[model samples]
Target: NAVGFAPELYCGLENCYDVLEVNREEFDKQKLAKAYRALARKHHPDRVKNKEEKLLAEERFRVIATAYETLKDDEAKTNYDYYLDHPDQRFYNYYQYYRLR
Candidate 1:
């Protein structure tokens, strides 16, 4: 049998935790920085060999850093946590700043 989660629950929603490989547990919070550093070391484009791997590495490099910034901050993490709980409103939470835009 084959099984997988909703694609929408990622990249747009789940990538923050999924990309960092962090679980919904406080134990992992204590190891966040270490995790980020290790992943950055291997995912950096300059660190990869094959052309395809390098390209994938480049994207991961950006996404990895992006996830770091979001979790590293207090307020941002709060908003993200809220979004995770109330995923039904995720679109508005992520880009609701438009009041008009």
Candidate 2:
């Protein structure tokens, strides 16, 4: 049997499950979507007045987006959960750099 895995995989950002206020152990898709929508509305750029506040809202929105992106998919979520469960084992990506002298 061939074991399935990705050559390049990214571990999720800090507390992706918590970002949407969902429990990683018992995550509900519907609940996670609802929470994301709530944050989307709350941190929408249009809801902010000043330019500074708008920028901050945009940043906040991106963080939420990132969180949602990471956990929305089953495969991605599984990979994220693996990293979360195995924090001691660091993920090391190796790349070859070409240098011409």
Candidate 3:
């Protein structure tokens, strides 16, 4: 069986807020959407001319999209913010898997 936890919570390789270039706590949804749209347009697959460039752009585009996806929802953002503030308390799915039932 697969397990999941707060995917957006900073497991630390640069959080979603930093990826999107927005403040974690005072973010504006409308602004975030606009920023994501701008980034997506710039990195759109069709815009790239070569196979290598397209591949790189595709990966970059995925990162931008994932950041937007996580921050767009209120609940996800809140949970993520909490984890950001309290790294020691951040939850990991593997820990739950090992927890005795």
Q: Candidate 3, clashing residue pairs?
A: none
| Model 2 error, position 51 (Å) | 0.9
Collision pairs in model 2: none
- True-structure RMSD, every candidate: 4.8, 9.2, 7.0
Number of the top candidate by lDDT? 3
lDDT of 2: 0.64
As a whole number from 0 to 100, the lDDT of residue 94 in candidate 2 is: 15
Candidate 1 regions exceeding 4 Å error are: 1-13, 27-30, 50-52, 90-92, 95-101
Clashes, model 3: 0
lDDT of each: 0.64, 0.64, 0.66
Model 2 spans > 4 angstroms off: 1-13, 92-101
Per-residue lDDT of 38-86 in model 1, one digit per residue for the tens?
A: 8888789998679999998998788788777667666667666666666
**TM-score for each of the candidates:** 0.69, 0.74, 0.73
Error of 1 at 6 (Å): 11
